[PDB]
Amino acid sequence: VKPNYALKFTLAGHTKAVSSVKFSPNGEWLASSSADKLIKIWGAYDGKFEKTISGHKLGISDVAWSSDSNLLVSASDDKTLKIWDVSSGKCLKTLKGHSNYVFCCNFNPQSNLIVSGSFDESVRIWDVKTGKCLKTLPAHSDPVSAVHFNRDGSLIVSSSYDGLCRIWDTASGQCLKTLDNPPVSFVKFSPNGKYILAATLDNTLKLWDKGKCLKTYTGHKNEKYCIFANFSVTGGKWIVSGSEDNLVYIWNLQTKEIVQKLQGHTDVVISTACHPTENIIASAALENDKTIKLWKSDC
Amino acid sequence: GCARSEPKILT
């Protein structure tokens, strides 16, 4: 039992490396960010280009949606985040305070807060309404590669090149858990909150419960980039990630076997995303490629 | 040009 993702659409238009793609929670849209300093919005089901959003002064490493699908936040080498009204394309707020590139970002499920991680080694928590920084966590001793909230916003998980994954109490700022030593290049909670998936730059993904690793997925290449990984849960239960051999890998969540590889890109697949209700994967690639692809499966 | 699209050099 394996999925049968097949290519349906190629979303071309960025003019440099794509950095991150995300489906909107309502399923209607895909947002992408790129080194070309733009964000683009695309139809999730037919890949139709919808709009270009502009204003960052340097390349963008991440983008993320608010719960209601009405706002985006982006993280840029310009040391700022920006909050966007996706209807109008306008920048509502510029979040200033990091002292080096902002690398990763996310809303909480309430979407009154944004969390960011930076090459400055900190995690910052921001008020969406005022754009003010509410907390700066001295979270890591090297760049922060990922930050994500759990399902009720009560926890944040962060990962870093310093080899640590840390779970934080949002409200108190306290570190509740620290999860060898390879750089941790990506982390996220599962769609239900109960697990975390972490990538390390030794070509390994791990599913963690107790502070214990329950599964390890390997076979792909990941020694250089902060590649997004995902749980796919609309059909069969898979783990999905890009890879530095230019493929999308899909693994069986429970058996850990590779069940499909998707071939379309001519550079590192930096980012993948899984649609919230249909079996659709978006993939995006770096400078030699510059495209996003939409793939669909019957399971 | 962004941080995500530049490699973390190991060795």
For chain A, the three-class secondary structure string (H helix, E strand, C coil) is: CCCCCEEEEEECCCCCCEEEEEECCCCCEEEEEECCCEEEEEECCCCCEEEEEECCCCCEEEEEECCCCCEEEEEECCCEEEEEECCCCEEEEEEECCCCCEEEEEECCCCCEEEEEECCCCEEEEECCCCCEEEEECCCCCCEEEEEECCCCCEEEEEECCCCEEEEECCCCCEEEECCCCCEEEEEECCCCCCEEEEECCCEEEEECCCCEEEEEECCCCCCCCCCEEEECCCCCEEEEECCCCEEEEEECCCCCEEEEEECCCCCEEEEEECCCCCEEEEEECCCCCCEEEEECCC
Nearest-angstrom CA–CA distance, A97 and A79: 8
> Is B10's CB within 8 Å of A58's CB?
no
Domain boundaries, chain A: 1-299
Residue type, A218: T
Substitution target from A77, A186, A268 for chain B, most B beta carbons within 10 A: A77
Residue A271: phi, psi to the nearest 5? Answer: -145, 135
Which of A207, A171, A164 lies closest to A189 in space, CA to CA? Answer: A207
Contacts of A183 in chain B (CB under 8 A): 8, 10
**Which pair of structure tokens corresponds to residue A152?**
């009720």
Question: In 3-state terms, what secondary structure has residue B9?
Answer: coil
Residue of chain B with shortest Cα separation from A33 = B2
Taking CA atoms, A258 is separated from A124, A216, A220, A227, in Å, by 36, 12, 9, 17
> Is A287's CB within 8 Å of B7's CB?
no
Determine how many CB atoms are found less than 10 A away from the CB of residue A274.
Answer: 19
Widest pairwise Cα distance in chain B: 24
Bridge partners (DSSP) listed for residue A293: A10, A283
If one looks up domain A1-299 in CATH, what number appears? 2.130.10.10
Nearest-angstrom CA–CA distance, A41 and A124: 26
Whole-number CA gyration radius for chain B: 8
Mention every residue, 6+ apart, whose C-beta is less than 8 A from residue A110.
Answer: A67, A153
Determine how many CB atoms are found less than 10 A away from the CB of residue A129.
Answer: 11
**Which pair of structure tokens corresponds to residue A168?**
């934080």
The rounded Cα A47 to chain-centroid distance in angstroms is 19
Task: Give how far A118 is from chain B: nearest CA, Å.
Answer: 10
Phi-psi sector, A181: left (phi>0), alpha (psi -120 to 50), beta: left
DSSP B3: G
B5 in reach of chain A (CB within 8 A): yes
Bridge partners (DSSP) listed for residue A123: A117, A137
Q: Are A7 and A260 in contact (CB under 8 A)?
A: no
Residue type, B3: A
- Angle among Cα A168, A73, A137 to the nearest 5 degrees reads 25
- Angle among Cα A93, A96, A102 to the nearest 5 degrees reads 105
Which of A185, A244, A184 lies closest to A220 in space, CA to CA? Answer: A244
What's the N-to-C CA distance of chain B in angstroms?
24
DSSP B2: -
Task: Give how far B9 is from chain A: nearest CA, Å.
Answer: 6
> Is A16's CB within 8 Å of B10's CB?
no
> Is B10's CB within 8 Å of A223's CB?
yes
Nearest-angstrom CA–CA distance, A4 and A111: 35
